[PDB]
Amino acid sequence: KPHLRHYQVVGRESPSEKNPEPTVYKFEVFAPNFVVAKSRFWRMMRVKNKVKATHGDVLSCKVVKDAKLVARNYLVDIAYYSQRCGYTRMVKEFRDVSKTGAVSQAYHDLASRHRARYHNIEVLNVKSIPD
Amino acid sequence: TDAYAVPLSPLLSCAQGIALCIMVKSHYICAGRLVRILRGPRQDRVGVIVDIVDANRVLVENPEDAKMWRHVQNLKNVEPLKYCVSVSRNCSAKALKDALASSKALEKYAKTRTAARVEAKKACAASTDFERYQLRVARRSRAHWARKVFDEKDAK
Amino acid sequence: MVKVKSLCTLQIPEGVTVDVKGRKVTVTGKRGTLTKDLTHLQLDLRVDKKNRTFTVIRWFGSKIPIACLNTTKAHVQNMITGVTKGYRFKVRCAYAHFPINVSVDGQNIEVRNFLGEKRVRRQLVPSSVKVSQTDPSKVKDEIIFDGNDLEQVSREAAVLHQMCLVKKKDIRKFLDGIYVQTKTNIEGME
RNA sequence: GGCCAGAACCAGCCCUACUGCAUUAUCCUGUCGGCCGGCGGGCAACGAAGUGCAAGAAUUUUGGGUCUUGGUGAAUGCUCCAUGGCGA
RNA sequence: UCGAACCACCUAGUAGCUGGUUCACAUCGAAGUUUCCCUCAGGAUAGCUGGUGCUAGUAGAAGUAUUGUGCGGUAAAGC
RNA sequence: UUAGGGAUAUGUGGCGUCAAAACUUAUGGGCUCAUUCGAUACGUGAAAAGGGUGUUGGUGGAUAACAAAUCCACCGGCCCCGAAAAUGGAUGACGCUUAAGCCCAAUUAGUGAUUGCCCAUUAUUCCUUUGGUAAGGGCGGAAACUUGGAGAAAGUGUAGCCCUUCCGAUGUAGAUGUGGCCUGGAGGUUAGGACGAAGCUUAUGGCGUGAGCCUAAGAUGGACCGGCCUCUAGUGCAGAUCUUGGUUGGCG
RNA sequence: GCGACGUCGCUUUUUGAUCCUUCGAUGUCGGCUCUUCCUAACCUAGCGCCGCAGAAGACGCUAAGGGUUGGAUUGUUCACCCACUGACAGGGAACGUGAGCUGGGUUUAGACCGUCGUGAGACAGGUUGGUUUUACCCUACUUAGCUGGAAAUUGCGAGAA
RNA sequence: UCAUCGAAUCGCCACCUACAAGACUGGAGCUUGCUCCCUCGAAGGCGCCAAGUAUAUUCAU
């Protein structure tokens, strides 16, 4: 029912004719599809690694399984962009069931109050909170 | 064209749900005790509420014997019953949902009233065209016999 | 955005009895009685027992839903207090030359030769707010309002100060007017 | 003849059940307390889905001539012969 | 009738200007651009377009990429 | 992006009424009250700083005391003012505000993997036309239960030689084709007519996509004339302040 | 109350552009007359506020509701004075308003003058004299009648404040 | 001159929908309003067609 599943996308940089064994990059992104995961996989590597989607290959994107469906806390360090105060990060600790669920509320909250939508939004540290 | 529940019988009323809800503070109504869901694909089941997560949303479950999973059902179709297990006066939200329900609080309610109406309206949906005759000779009987009793009252 | 803070409570002693019927409040005592209305968002007034506790819970909350709860707390205590203790309202004046007269006739108030205006300035007062003068000699100036209700005698001990101003004129150099004086909670043990 | 209704094969849109089919991790235990850290073996997959095979059977619509026939046991082959039902 | 009368004639004077130009269906189907013109309300010439074609034509094909291989000095940059 | 129809499905745009579609979605996440809210791009731009002691969001840095919590500074709007004209007045109208507004999502409801739903000259499929000179196959006598054709003729063109197959199909100026339409007349042929020709009338049908043709019936007409192949031209009219004739409105 | 320095929004009875509409004709300014509209308030109207004691002004806000003159010179708009007034505010309506008037200015054909030109003539320089057609049509308005009408002329169609 | 379209009907509707009394004694009743659906009520008993398979109900105010 909550959209925006959680994808585990990993990939080298088409090895290599120069380096012959480029370091593998893996990161987990929330996305509606996996085409949208790879689209934002090759945005981190184009920026945080200077690697094109052309000059590299996706090793194994994957759908993370779940957590036993039970309520718990979540602080989601989220970073959006807007003409509304360009590139501000946030914390916005939510209380939903799964990481997919809470990050959904994260997006539907920023697009609600900052009108920042999916591609203007990076995510980091979707972790939980005991108390 | 109006279906009726009187008074003030209602135009244009869909026969697949109602806007029942009147807003109430969450904590008073419910606390991991027991509840039933009106509008679900599984229809009119009762599951004791495992916990409250955020505001409207609840986690609703039931031990077994009902094909009811542990799941996230929203208060918009989940309405409290006063057959609680762990809400309110009783000291804590309990665990071991089967054992707490092995206090027959569900078994008592499933054989008490307001559950004889749940399957009543679910009987009038599975009544084939033969029991609908049975129901009509049953009302017609109680009907005129009611008139006979009225005649007796007139005599008295 | 939205949260919950606390709950509001008032104790109801002997000599004061509060109802809850039609979600409205009735407070009576041994010096006066008064009833009024206190509706607002998420503000459902329910009195637990007849003389135990006036509780007003709200389930939602924000700056506006919570800046409206404890004003009924400011407006339920003075129901219970006014029916036993009551708050008196006093009014004074000043003069330099104009010798004056004033009047009160049963249910109305007169103001004659105000600043030189030789006519009457009427004003209606509700059923049960009785007042006299001490123009005779010892005080000579004051109008002392008595009663029971916080805002049903404050409402008219507000207009006599609206019935006063001198408009196209320097105001500070001279003080024409019998104006409301010294907001005060007068109690008594005499 | 025109007006209908029903039926039957053709293809077509299809009703779709069960969904199997593999994978992947989910998850199986241990003693701890109202700030939580002291971890390991996959041997379980009915709420794992970026994923493979299904007709008999549901529907109006549209067109109707070179047919149909009988099953065998293996590791699918011999084959034979020449529309009806109303109303007007 | 007069900043050149009136009648008839040359005379149906000329007009790069204005108005109009009579049936159907079918098959296709544009241009306002080039150069030249006392040229810029027009022409001529190419282009566009139609018809008829001729001819051995998966080629002497391409508003496309690839591969190599040249070219360039705008953006950004730098003073 | 466009031949004539039917169906299936979409596009853009939408689904409170007008208005087909959520008969007001079991909608979900927040936002929003706005004394001219706000609400489809491009229409032209809507509103510019500025602040606050305002409603919601975020970061720097205290106290454990404000008058068991309470601060000192700003980032971010939704929103308040800043801001105004002249017929009455516009989201398109009503209207909506615990939305029918805004931003995100959804699509049968956390039960289990698809198309929520409505609209086209689009798409798919089905017929029908028509062109391509597009491919084929027959291009003179045989049978599937009832008729049609794998027997209708060696053919650009039709009432196609016959089937069936593919594909395309808009269009101003323009070009071109038509076994194509029509008027006057000629050379041929075939043929009508006082038992009623031309003409004329039309709720006279039919049939050709059309130009048009043919029929009927005239309480019309009275004496000429149709089809076909060639020939021929003073050959088709709604529109030229057309020309001529006649009528008409305004108009008793 | 504004003024250095400055700037930044919105302004047309604005200075000009633009060449989009009009060349088989949207008839030229100003008035007269009459109606309307706006507020950026001139007057009255409402408090407000000051070194606003009375007096009397002073600043301000709210309000388009009502009111806003008569003359002299000018064709004028504007301007200027005269005088009244509570004050004589500023605008739109095709620079409101000629099938309404006027015809003073633009205004051609006559004529004179100034400068210019060899001359014919030119001047957006001056001066004088110089057409002002048509509603009998449709609507608008204004009054004046008549008659139908509830499935707003129809079904029998059925709804009584 | 009518042949019609229409197709539940009210002394149980139809002040009120909601009171009164539970952070644990139930209240409910100011009610899923009745009744209607093939012989006035459930147990029978009874005639029906040829109106010859659908065709506006060949009914009914």
Ligand SMILES: [Mg+2]
């Ligand atoms: Mg540069």
Ligand SMILES: [Mg+2]
């Ligand atoms: Mg359709």
Ligand SMILES: [Mg+2]
């Ligand atoms: Mg919402």
Ligand SMILES: [Mg+2]
């Ligand atoms: Mg001739």
Ligand SMILES: [Mg+2]
């Ligand atoms: Mg001619």
Ligand SMILES: [Mg+2]
């Ligand atoms: Mg003619």
Ligand SMILES: [Mg+2]
């Ligand atoms: Mg004409």
Ligand SMILES: [Mg+2]
């Ligand atoms: Mg004029």
Ligand SMILES: [Mg+2]
């Ligand atoms: Mg005068």
Ligand SMILES: [Mg+2]
């Ligand atoms: Mg008229």
